Write a protein that binds this DNA or RNA. Structure first.
Lengths: 88, 93, 95
DNA sequence: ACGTAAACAGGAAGTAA
DNA sequence: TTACTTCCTGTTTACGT
C-alpha cells in the first residue's frame, strides 16, 4: 500500500529472508543489483496491489518506465541486472 | 590450435573440474573457453556441437533447476555407472 | 493432434492464403487457428514461437502499417528471392 | 527442417492514485 | 500530474532434442 517498485526492491534487498535468495547486489557500491528469482520478486510486487499472478513481463515494463524518470537504468549485457541512479 | 579431444571428453573434463561434479551448459562453455582459447564464444558452431553431444550421450544425465536458484538452463552430471572410466580417459589426447 | 508442419511453414501458408500476399501477426494467428484447432489462442506459447520465427527468418520481410486500418502491428510478406519454393513446400508434411 | 521458453524494448490505452 | 498495468508487436538470448 502506497509503495513504489524501486522502494519495494530496496526493501527486499535489505531484508535477510530475501537478501541473497530472490535479489542480490552485484556491485552494492554502484547500486547495481540482479533479480535472482525474477518470477518470485514479480509475484511479491503484485501481492501489494493484490494482483497475484504478476509476471516479470508486466513488472519489467514498470522497470523500463523507470529509465525515463532516471531512477533505475538497465545493465546492458548482464541478465537480470539494473542500477538505481537515485541512492544515499 | 584445435585441442585433440572429443567434445564429449571436454564435457567430462569440465564436469570433473566442477566442485559438486555438475555444470550448466553455460558453465561448461566457460570451462572450455578458459582452458582452450581456440574455442572463442564468438563462433557458436562448437557450442551447438557440445549441446548435441549432451543431448545424445546417455552417460550425460540432466538435473532440473529448482526454486533455490531458478536460472538459465539445467545442471549436467556424469552417470556414476561409467563415470570413473570417462574421467580417467578424459585427458587421453 | 499437433499439425506436422514447421511454424515457418505455417506462416508461409498463412501468407499465401492472404489476398495481397501479406498478413499482420494477428492475421497470421487467426489463419492458423481457423486452419488447425490444436492451436487455441487460449495458450500463448505457440504465438510466441511464431513471433520468434518471424523475427529470425530473413525470408520473412516486414511492411509498415497504413491508414486503411491503423491498429495492432505491421504487415508481413515473403521475400520474392525464395518465396516460390517456400510456397511449394509450405504443405509438405513431416516424416 | 527447429521447438520452446524466457529476457528486454517501447508505443499505446487502462487504472489508480 | 505521477506511477505503474494490461496488452501487443517485435527483437534477442539461451537451452535442449
Amino acid at each position: 500500500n502506497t509503495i513504489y517498485l524501486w522502494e519495494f526492491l530496496l526493501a527486499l534487498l535489505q531484508d535477510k529472508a530475501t537478501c541473497p535468495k530472490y535479489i542480490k547486489w552485484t556491485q552494492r557500491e554502484k547500486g547495481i543489483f540482479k533479480l535472482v528469482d525474477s518470477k518470485a520478486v514479480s509475484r511479491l510486487w503484485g501481492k501489494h496491489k493484490n494482483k497475484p499472478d504478476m509476471n516479470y513481463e508486466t513488472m519489467g515494463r514498470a522497470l523500463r518506465y523507470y529509465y525515463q524518470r532516471g531512477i533505475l537504468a538497465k545493465v546492458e549485457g548482464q541478465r537480470l541486472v539494473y542500477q538505481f541512479k537515485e541512492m544515499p | 590450435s584445435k585441442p585433440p579431444f572429443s567434445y564429449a571428453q571436454l564435457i567430462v573434463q569440465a564436469i570433473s573440474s566442477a566442485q559438486d561434479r555438475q555444470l550448466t551448459l553455460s558453465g561448461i562453455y566457460a570451462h572450455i573457453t578458459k582452458h582452450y582459447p581456440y574455442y572463442r564464444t564468438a563462433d557458436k558452431g562448437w557450442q551447438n556441437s557440445i549441446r548435441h553431444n549432451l543431448s545424445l550421450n546417455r552417460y550425460f544425465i540432466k538435473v532440473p533447476r529448482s526454486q533455490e536458484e531458478p536460472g538459465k538452463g539445467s545442471f549436467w552430471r556424469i552417470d556414476p555407472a561409467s563415470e570413473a572410466k570417462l574421467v580417467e580417459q578424459a585427458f587421453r589426447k
